[PDB]
Structures are given as C-alpha cells and as structure tokens.
Amino acid sequence: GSSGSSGMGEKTWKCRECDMCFSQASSLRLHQNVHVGEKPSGPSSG
Numbered sequence: 001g002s003s004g005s006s007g008m009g010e011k012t013w014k015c016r017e018c019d020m021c022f023s024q025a026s027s028l029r030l031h032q033n034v035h036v037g038e039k040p041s042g043p044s045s046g
C-alpha cells in the first residue's frame, strides 16, 4: 500500500535555496526576497 498522508496534512513551508522552514507560508513568500540581490545563491559557486 503506497499511500501518502492518510491522516492530518502538514504545515511545512521551507525555502528553495536556504530551505528554511517557515511555520507560515506567507512569511516565506516574502522572505524568498532575500534571495534577490547579493549572494542570492543563483550562479553555481562556493
């Protein structure tokens, strides 16, 4: 039985680059901004 969430869902809104968990999905939406300028983690490097 390959099933997923049988019971309650899950509130986990992690970022993309930094992959930071944000209890609130909205808060993250705005946070993502931080990744728009300096060391945005776009071009492969480091």
Ligand SMILES: [Zn+2]
Residues within 6 Å of the ligand: 015, 016, 017, 018, 019, 020, 031, 032, 034, 035
């Ligand atoms: Zn982030």
